[PDB]
Amino acid sequence: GVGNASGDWHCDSTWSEGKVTTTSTRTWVLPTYNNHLYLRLGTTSNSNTYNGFSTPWGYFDFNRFHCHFSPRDWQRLINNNWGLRPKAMRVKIFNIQVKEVTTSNGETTVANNLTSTVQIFADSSYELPYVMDAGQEGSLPPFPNDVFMVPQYGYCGIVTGENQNQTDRNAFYCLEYFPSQMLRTGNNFEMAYNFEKVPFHSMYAHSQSLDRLMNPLLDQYLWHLQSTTSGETLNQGNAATTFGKIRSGDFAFYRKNWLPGPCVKQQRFSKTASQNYKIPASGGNALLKYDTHYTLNNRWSNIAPGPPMATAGPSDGDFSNAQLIFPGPSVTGNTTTSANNLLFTSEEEIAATNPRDTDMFGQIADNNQNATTAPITGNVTAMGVLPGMVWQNRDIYYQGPIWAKIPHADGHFHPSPLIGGFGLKHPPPQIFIKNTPVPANPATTFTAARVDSFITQYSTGQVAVQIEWEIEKERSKRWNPEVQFTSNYGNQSSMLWAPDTTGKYTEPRVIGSRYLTNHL
């Protein structure tokens, strides 16, 4: 009925010995996009050209972690458990209120239209292109008491060449072609979903460095050739070759059982403006050209933080493109001069297992040495996976995405979003929503032309998302106290992680999940 609420606002976290369940609700506003029509989209810009469509529909996105975890909760989670992975989810939209706007002259009036319908469907079948997954605004806001605007749905189409235009292959997906539920106030929508078994994300830092796992005290039983000649001078000395049983201490020489990492090199820049070479953002030598990129169908796509690699700590004066950058509290606009106002994610913790972003993978003999010809070593920058390699994935972040859909392709290797998160073949479905059109008074004599005059409307209501996370406690045997993340903030005039006098809420730092320790 019109008079009855169709759902209660509950946001909660319930913790278990084995599983924690998060639940949060938010209020949303839904405009009328593109005055009700699908629009072709395309621009051709050389290293950017793209093509696609913009839709009258909007969608709900809960892909950021902070959507379901209050800071404290995130804390609880990461200081206590080694791994976590999502198990099941369920969503419900309710208290739909459709508003109609009179828009008188000078003043715009708004009043409820009780008999109006907003339509929601979610598609399981994954027939619509998935977009919820990468790098984008629209997720519910972290702070509960913040109303948000449902994002408009638009999708990309395959672009052939450096020039944007469409081939027969390009396709059009029309949301109205799908069956969807129609609601009015007093109507509600609900759906459930079960995640697929997925590797627990590792929420620990290695307490051992891969290269040396051996017993410091003993020495291998293998021998290596130590020197072709005597002395410490490169090209002089007595001819004889000498072999020696690998002894305790010459660890760098120990034959090991594993190779540390897959790797792609990244350019490095210094946070101090002064240190960098001059590089423009446009023109023949715009930065893009010098930053590690992957050429695809004639178009440079700059590699996103790439195959997981070690990166300078957050405080460090140098930073690489490999690390993710978050706004930070103080920044006002879209652009800023000093990087002291930004937040940098860093994977120092990964260093124990795999190569550094700005440094190389290693160096290989790139030549066959000989008495008359000197040995030459080649610098290796790109290294595909090799038998016996072991690496760590990029960590997840409080404000980082949670899942991402694994491309529907013949081949994929070690799916783990590179931006961080769990790779799913069938990820939480995008739930679409749109305000049904309505018509302005219409002409008395019939005209075939499609109607174009519509009443102005917008809707609002609350959505509630609940996720059941499966986690695993630590159970370590380490004796010395671990590192844990605790605020440690100095005396503050207006406390952190809280709304302020203005009433504004902003997240102070970016937070990872690897504080606990574990050995290899």
Q: Residues 420 to 459: which contact ligand D5M by CB under 6 A?
A: 422-423
- Is residue 414 close enough to count as binding ligand D5M by CB under 6 A? yes
Q: Where does residue 235 rank: exposed (0-12), middle (13-18), buried (19+ CB within 10 A)?
A: exposed
Query: CB–CB of 94/462 below 8 Å?
Result: yes
367 binds, among ligand D5M, a second copy, none (CB under 5 to 8 A by kind): none
Among residues 38, 62, 397, 469, which is the contact residue for a second copy, using CB under 8 A? 38
Q: Rule CB under 8 A: say whether 119 interacts with a second copy.
A: yes
Closest CA to 51 of 203, 162, 193, 175: 162
**Residue among 327, 415, 437, 508 that touches ligand D5M (CB under 6 A):** 415
From the CB of residue 53, how many other CB atoms can be counted at a distance below 10 Å?
21
CA 62 from centroid of its chain's CA atoms? 12
Q: Which of 175, 198, 339, 419 binds ligand D5M (CB under 6 A)?
A: 198
Q: Is 447 in the site for a second copy (CB under 8 A)?
A: yes
Distance of alpha carbon 353 from alpha carbon 207, whole angstroms: 10
Q: Which entry of a second copy, ligand D5M, none binds 416, CB below 5 to 8 A by partner kind?
A: ligand D5M
Q: Does 15 help bind a second copy (rule: CB under 8 A)?
A: no
Residues 72-91 that bind a second copy (CB under 8 A): none
422 binds, among a second copy, ligand D5M, none (CB under 5 to 8 A by kind): ligand D5M
Torsion of CA 416, 422, 423, 426, to 10 degrees: 180
Q: Could you say whether residue 401 binds ligand D5M (CB under 6 A)?
A: no
CA 278 to chain centre: 30
Give the whole-angstrom CA distance, residue 26 versus residue 30: 13
Q: How far is the CB of 403 from ligand D5M (least distance, A)?
A: 8
User: Measured from the CB of residue 104, what is the shortest distance to ligand D5M in angstroms?
Assistant: 55
Contact 13, 67 (CB under 8 A): no
36 versus 271: smaller Cβ distance to a second copy: 36
Q: How far is CA 256 from the centre of its chain?
A: 34
Q: By CB under 6 A, which span of 273-281, 383-391, 410-418, 508-516 interacts with ligand D5M?
A: 410-418
**Residue 389 binds a second copy, judged by CB under 8 A:** no
CA–CA separation, 405 and 195 (whole Å): 12
Q: From the list 21, 49, 152, 227, which residue makes contact with a second copy (rule: CB under 8 A)? A: 152
**Torsion angle defined by CA atoms of residues 368, 369, 375 and 381, in that order, rounded to the nearest 10 degrees:** 20
Which amino acid type is present at position 450? R
Q: Per CB under 6 A, which region of 140-148, 247-255, 414-422, 507-515 contacts ligand D5M?
A: 414-422
274 versus 447: smaller Cβ distance to a second copy: 447
**Tokens in use for 94?**
């309710």
Cα-atom radius of gyration of the chain, to the nearest Å? 28
Q: Which residues bind ligand D5M (CB under 6 A)?
A: 198-199, 414-416, 422-423
